[PDB]
Amino acid sequence: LDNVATYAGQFNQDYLSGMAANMSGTFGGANMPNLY
């Protein structure tokens, strides 16, 4: 078993008049660039 995960939970933001960014990102591994 091999696992990569992001858990993000519950944003409470009533009467918002400014700016807000709520951002979640998950990226997999084992990448391989080859120059021969």
Partner: protein, 64 residues
């Protein structure tokens, strides 16, 4: 506002060959603005590869 022109004889993104030419002219330079995502490569190789992924952002302006 954003990206307006006035005055006299101003220019954006100019074409090649404004001087005197008896050979080859190709392309030109580059100019980028603020608040941006732009990975970049300048190369004189025999073979060249660029590879990019997974880009996120708000990219916003408020002026109330």
């Amino acid at each position: 506002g954003f990206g307006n022109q006035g005055g006299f004889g101003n220019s954006r993104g100019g074409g090649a060959g404004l001087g005197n030419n008896q050979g080859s002219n190709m392309g030109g330079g580059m100019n980028f603005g603020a608040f941006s995502i732009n990975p970049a490569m300048m190369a004189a190789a025999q073979a060249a590869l660029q590879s990019s992924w997974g880009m996120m952002g708000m990219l916003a302006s408020q002026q109330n």
